[PDB]
Every structure is written in C-alpha cells, then in structure tokens.
Amino acid sequence: HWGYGKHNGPEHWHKDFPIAKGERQSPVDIDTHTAKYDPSLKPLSVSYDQATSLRILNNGHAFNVEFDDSQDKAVLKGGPLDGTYRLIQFHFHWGSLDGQGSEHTVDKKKYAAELHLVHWNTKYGDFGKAVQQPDGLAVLGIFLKVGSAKPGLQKVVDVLDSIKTKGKSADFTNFDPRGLLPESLDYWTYPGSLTTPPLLECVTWIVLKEPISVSSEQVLKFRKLNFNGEGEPEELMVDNWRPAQPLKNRQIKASFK
Ligand SMILES: O=C(O)Sc1ccc(O)cc1O
C-alpha cells in the first residue's frame, strides 16, 4: 500500500487514487505577493476551552491525537467558514532534516514540520459524511520552525516512546490544544484536499501566517517513530510530507494586508 518511500510514495499515489491529479489538490506553495487580501474575511474563532482528548495513535504514516467529537466541545468558526466545525484529530508532517518537513511552503520556503488540526462541518452529522462534501472539512495548518522549545508540545513528545510502531495507541486525556497556537491568528485560505490518500477534495485550508517554534530535541523525538509494525524491519518515520501541487484555477486569499 501507499507510503512515502521510493516505491510507494507520492509520485505513485495517482495509480490507486486518480484524484491525486485533481483540480484542487493540496498542498500548495503560497506566493505571498499574489495572494489577495480580502477585507470580507472574518477573524477566526477558535473555541478549544472544552476539548476532550482521548488517545494518541501511530497509524503507520503519522501519529494522531484523537478527540471526542460527539458534541460541540472544541470548535472552529468564522474566517472563511460557514457554520460550525468540530475538532476530531490533529497530526503532524515532518522532515528528516530541519530544512524540510512542512507540506505547504511560503514563497518556496520549507519549515521543519507542519501541524494539521482537522475539523468537520457539523451539518453533515459525522466525519464520514463530511469528507464527501466540498465544504466538509476545515484544517488549520501551523508551521513549526526550530528554535526555542514549546512547552505545550512536550506532553505529546513525552508519550511518543509508547507508540513507536504502527498500530500502537495510548490513552491521552486532558491535553489542551490551545498550547499549540501561535499568538496571532492571521491566515491564508484556499480550497484544497487531504494531503494523504484518499486525497479527497473536501478541505477549506486555513494556514496561519505565524509559525510556532519548537526545539531541536523536540522534533528529534518525532524522527524516532517507526513506519513499520513491531517485529518488522525498522523504517524511521521521517519525510511524511507530500510535495506542493499545481495551484491551477484558484486564488489564495489573505486575512491580512
Ligand atoms: O481521530 C480520529 O481520527 S479517531 C475518531 C474517530 C471518530 C470519532 O468520532 C472521533 C475520533 O476521535
């Protein structure tokens, strides 16, 4: 099946997922000089005070932190969105080296990693229905650069030891995702897709302008995870990012001038 190596990586995905060559694929490079400032855009509203985290999982292509999404506890509203989007999970993409790892780029600049906070439009009742709709998902993308440590990230990095291989999970309660946000919520937004198979074109991307800083030791622990299951040859979980895709007939909009 699919992954990120030479024989099953992104340049091969289109044979099983033909939408990979679709018209609204992600990620993309954000050219900051051709993005359109849009005064019509509202500030984002992040209400994460009642988030209920459940579990952290190694799924063979990243680690996911999963939330209880049976009620409007942790929601995203405003910005370019219509309606209420519930948080269901977050994950990261990262590199083998600090000079690469993000999926979106900014004027061709790569960051060391990218955080994806995945939300689905409550109007469609569950996540499974939402991914079949052009306005079904809203994904907050946040860049990570290497510098000072991020206190709110350390609880995540401390548990990675326990989910090193594919299929492992651990209880992960009382984690507050507010500690992963930058100070400013200025953003770029464009319509796009999941960046992993099945690559569905159901995502409103909201990419924050301001990165968060993490220390080298924090992202080093990310790179110790494994793509393989226990009892298999070890393949380190690194470079789980898809390269930038042709923007084609879209305009990236900015919430700031
Ligand atoms: O995060 C996931 O992807 S796992 C999950 C599945 C369904 C659900 O309603 C809530 C979840 O957190």
Ligand SMILES: Oc1ccc(S)c(O)c1
């Ligand atoms: O549900 C999702 C899985 C992976 C990725 S990159 C998403 O953006 C959503």
Ligand SMILES: [Zn+2]
């Ligand atoms: Zn992602």
